[model samples]
Target chain A: GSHMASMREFIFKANKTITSSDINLKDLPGSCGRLDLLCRCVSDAFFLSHDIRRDVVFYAVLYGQPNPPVCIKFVGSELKKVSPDERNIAIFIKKALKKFEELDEEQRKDWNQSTPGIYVRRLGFRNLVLEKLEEGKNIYYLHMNGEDVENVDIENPVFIIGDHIGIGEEDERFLDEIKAKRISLSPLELHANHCMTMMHNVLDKKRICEI
Target chain B: GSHMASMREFIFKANKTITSSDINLKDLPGSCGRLDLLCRCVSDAFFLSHDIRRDVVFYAVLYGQPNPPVCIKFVGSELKKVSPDERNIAIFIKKALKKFEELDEEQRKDWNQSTPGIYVRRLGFRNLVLEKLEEGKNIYYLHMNGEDVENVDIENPVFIIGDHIGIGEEDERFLDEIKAKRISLSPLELHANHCMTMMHNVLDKKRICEI
Candidate 1:
């Protein structure tokens, strides 16, 4: 499905009417290095088809399973945890998921990359102040959010930026909520796009300098 | 428009409202590791740039040319080709470029940060994926994307998340697109906020876990 009609269709539609003045871009999902890990895990699993990934899935953050010491790559200083646009996107996506349940199919189809469906009231967020946690293994967490934001509206149909693996909690919550809301809803126009847009903006402008 | 009436006006609008938070984040789940790359890239780039950046551009990558050996910052024993956040953010930023142009100068000036976009897309992109054939190198042609892609589309802008200095395909494409897009974009954003946000959270978490 990676290279299916969706893939080529995205490019062709993108490049078709794009003019010199037009900003041309086709939104696609990032694999988040799972392919590399998958290759290794599969090699080790041998029976690789279902069992290998099943173990990884059961242990990953989604299921709240901590990775084994051996499975955990000694990222060392090479990779340090931080705030990302993806995380921000994940937050808003959750809201969209909740909204999906109320919308009908016709409204859903328009929520694709080519169209903007729901009127964005705001991204679902409370605050993210860094806080220390004594959970285990140099744990850290944010003390900003509670169970959920009250009365926040979701996207009409659904929004999907990219793929599921490496999808953060906010994003997972978003997709899950969206699926729960509308079983047949087509997920596109992900909140992750908004996150990246905002992330890039935060960087380009010096907050200390100007607005 | 990015000027936004005047710095005074923008500052007034931004700082017009403020408040203190009463919540602590120790109870949160995975906020600590959300966008880890954002922090790592910024911190690493800051150090790298301080030690070796020239504020000039000299490398290039284009459609017709053969890709040079993929190069990236070393990870463990091997080098990483691309990052998930970096890759995903690249697509979202570009999409905003077109949406950016529709904004009149005044509105854009209001949200100056959002107006000047960022994201780099191309064939065979890698981390620091740039190369020079050298003095006695083979007779290879440079791929001039300017003419082929024609007028630069800033819609999806991209910039070197790390250093600018001596350039390469990774950095050069990012630079050229920003300049061409005419919105005043930068790859520099990738690091600035990411570092502060990351370290602040991590240091506290590490401290807590130790306790």
Candidate 2:
């Protein structure tokens, strides 16, 4: 059993083609691939145990479509499938997000925030990315040949990574403005899933979660 | 822009299915997938520049096949392809292995051990596994829910992992006999490549590699 505390979290933001409101599973190959990779990342990042209290949160921000960002939230303890297929996960995320989007203002306000498990909500991508920065938290932006990851003293740092297309030019600029220090795991460009796994590895190895 | 020595290293052993003499390339789906995943691990684990001294080594042990259990070794810097496909990599390994096997005893004895790069040899799986242990070095056997990686003090620790069909029962027994402590990243079983990435993550974050 793991401790229930504020553990290190991850955010894999998929921009450009992913739809916020309605994900067209039949046609959007780009969106589907990114979404699938994001789900895979979640599955790999957080392993088994349905009862473990949610400490880490993995957010899949759908900011490509013409609407407010639809964030698919995967709480550590709430994720049901330990090993999820990309297609099935995409559909599940879409359905849950659809229901969440249909709620009226009052119903949405009264929504149980303490619900233990995977859920969906409308969140601002920019707001989410910069939220911790404003609160004086360290956010490390991953890049190739950036500052060596070993040299940094990570403390509740938010790891921001990109998908297939990578955090686009705009998002990169936004992160830059926040002055998020760019950290490199290795000299190569790794897949988003690899980046997520590596981030957890660092966190796990440093015993930061225990702290 | 990295030190050649003291970098992290990983060994992913595929014992039963992969052939020591020749990889069928078509008939064995299990072997093929593991081989492919191993290649992908290389791609994510290390990016390329042929001149840079090798930092890590990924060895695929084909113990099930006849001919002294062929072992194909991939050195980080020597790998020319930044993105290697499974089929092409298989062919390349086969060719190099064939040539090495053809070497006579006298020539093989004179073979310089200091050669830095990718190559193949007829090294026994058990021999290699124990050889490292005999050097009085700490080897971490990767298991899904073993000891917490964070709690361990890792110093040039060699991470031993399995392929799609993880380390076999006999190998597990051997490791147990040797008392190699099993360390895990998460509870869920991860792809072999992800394991390597995570292992490096822990090493990099702890600054153990720099030491």
Candidate 3:
């Protein structure tokens, strides 16, 4: 059952072609609406249940300064909400980023376990997708009309989505890097969290069909 | 084929059992976090490409005084964004509310089209759900282990979700008034927007199956 399913994933490309700073956490909704959207999606992906399972991985591609591209892996199961209120989910994310920034040179360079459920690692959006493709994961890209995802047979499906600005050029090219199938939820462009939510629905449907 | 799928919908019950007021919108992250979340979800639901179609309806059950238990119906396709920056989406919503407030009593009573792509009207949470039920529309309430959702047959799904506080008790009881089916996207509880995102996912998958 999907209640116990594993390997379900969502990757969000939070392209910082615009504002890229830790101070904006003070006004996440105002500073970067897309980042706030990304935070909400990540919250949706991570805080699934109090009865936790680490079956989900939420990747945030921070394309910004200090270092250009970094991936923030907010994994489920192993992650515990430091706070319960979902509204502060963005603050939790900001704390994670601040923690990552404060990490020593050695810890900052690798996949540093920022917190119990949060992981900080360096990987460009393209490389992360490549790593997943190399693992033979059933990869899908969210778009207008890529595939009728229901027809794609796979136990663990990984969805790649974008911020409010849409997926960036380098990463958009990388969807082809792994020959990732382009699948769509609606004819309309959707927010990254909306896409992630739909991915969960699709996977849940698949799990039921098997059952 | 779903590029033209119509009758898509989402309902958000913004309970003020805790915090409610303008001070919250100012420090949106702290005051009523769900307002920000609801704005993001609504943004995701409507305003796609701007060519416009009135197929979507976003209901916000404002559960407090000065505007107690008022359902703001943001409807149709003629709505235009006062601003394009997605982050200020909540501000746009705030502006709509201000517009509704300043409207003449007659205009406020009707569907005062508050700018393109935005509509405003007054209805209670229960009244709105009952309205849909009276329409003979299938209703799905987001919850865990309620139904796999994929097993249900539907074209346009009316999804009922809540903010960080989740749906209120009286409104929770109202779902029973319509015999709304309980459905879950994940075993864990999700943010209201996440739930909405999953609802879109569920309906899109259903549309794919029908095709």
Candidate 4:
């Protein structure tokens, strides 16, 4: 079951424009275009009291300023110095972006370690989804009209969620093209971070039942 | 079902010593002792995308500086001018505290309206729980060793959760004295805000299944 928990993955799309390294820590919402929300998503995705959910992996696709597409990955098992607050989480993100900026174009093509447990890459949403498809992981796009997540039978699930602005139409089309399943966590729309928590809750309960 | 949702209540205890109205919003964690965490809890408890969970009620019992045991309530249905960010949420909290301070000592005994949907009162934990019990509501204390929340059969449930520091020793004895049922959301301890999400998830799924 621990192994199964490690297989759960969450991908969040930050549609707001934000500089990778130059985010105003004091004004995450105003200066960074709701990067505060993304920080919350990161916090909720991997943190537990006095522990990290080592079984989970979190990816944030940044479609922000200076860099059009920057993908940041937080490997839960290796995470350190990351706290469950917007400012603390943003500091790690700033470091990751700064590290990514130091890379050459060729180096940027692949995932590069930014800090312990954090990785950055010049990856786009389409390519990222395709890569996950190659790994044969179940892909689910969170949407209001999708099947209730509680009844969705899946394995090695990789959930794709969008920020407040939501996934771009072109990406939604790509998800459709790949036959990615759509799942709804609630009848009412929820924040991306809240959605992440709901996903973990549903999956955690399933794991407990199996045990 | 909506009626049942409205009946749901969450009480969070902030044990940090913080001044009611003079919170350093810039350093919610440093100066206010993780009132930032409480802000997140409030955000998660009520806010949804393009909507608010008017069915829910959130109470924060502040045992902090200048004033001890200031109970601030956010009536979800009437909540206005509150955003999900810690700073924005903190502003509301600050306002509530300031409003509470302006009231005479006699007026402080009962809940006083601060802003739209926000109320302040000088209430302690025991009396709050006792009042709910008097209302014939099921009371549950969130604990690591409690029964798994998914299996709990409850109605008009009011959940009592402690901060990162956890419930006081005396309060624990009180919970036991009332035979308040204990409920656990996960094997690993989770953030108080995450715990709220898990509780909502379990209850939401149950509602959907009944539907």
List of chain B TM-scores, one per candidate? 0.22, 0.76, 0.80, 0.95
Ranking by TM-score: 4, 3, 2, 1
The candidate maximizing DockQ is 4
- Cα lDDT tens digits, model 1, A1-211, are 1221100000000011111111111121222222212211112211111121121110111111121111111111121221123332232222333343345545543332111221211112111000101111111111122112112222211112222233346644643543322111111111222222222233223322332
Best by lDDT: 4
The C-alpha interface RMSD of every prediction is 19.1, 7.0, 5.1, 1.8
Which regions in candidate 4 have their CA more than 4 angstroms from the true location?
Answer: A1-5, B1-6, B209-211
Deviation from native of the Cα of residue B206 in model 2, angstroms: 13
Native-to-model Cα distance after best TM-score fit, residue B58 in candidate 3, in Å: 1.9
Backbone clashes for every candidate come to 16, 1, 14, 2
lDDT of 2 by residue, A1-211 (tens): 3543345667778765365446755433454434545655665566422222255777777666565466666777565543333334555666666666677645543322323456666666677777666776678887875797767867767788776677788888888887878998865566676776666666655554444
Model 1 Cα shift for residue B38 (angstroms): 18
**Model 1 DockQ class:** incorrect
* TM-score of each model, in listed order: 0.20, 0.56, 0.72, 0.91
Q: Give the Å shift of residue A9 in candidate 2.
A: 2.2
lDDT tens digits, residues B149-191, model 1? Answer: 1222212112222221122455446545433222212323223
Candidate 3: residue A89 lDDT (0-100): 58
**lDDT, candidate 3, B23-69, per-residue tens:** 35445554554465566566655644333336777777776546655
Model 2 chain A worst lDDT window (10 residues): A107-116
Which ranges in model 2 have alpha carbons more than 4 Å from their true place? Answer: A1-5, A20-33, A48-54, A66-68, A82-88, A100-116, A130-137, A208-211, B1-159, B163-169, B173-192, B199-211
**Model 3 Cα RMSD, Å?**
5.0
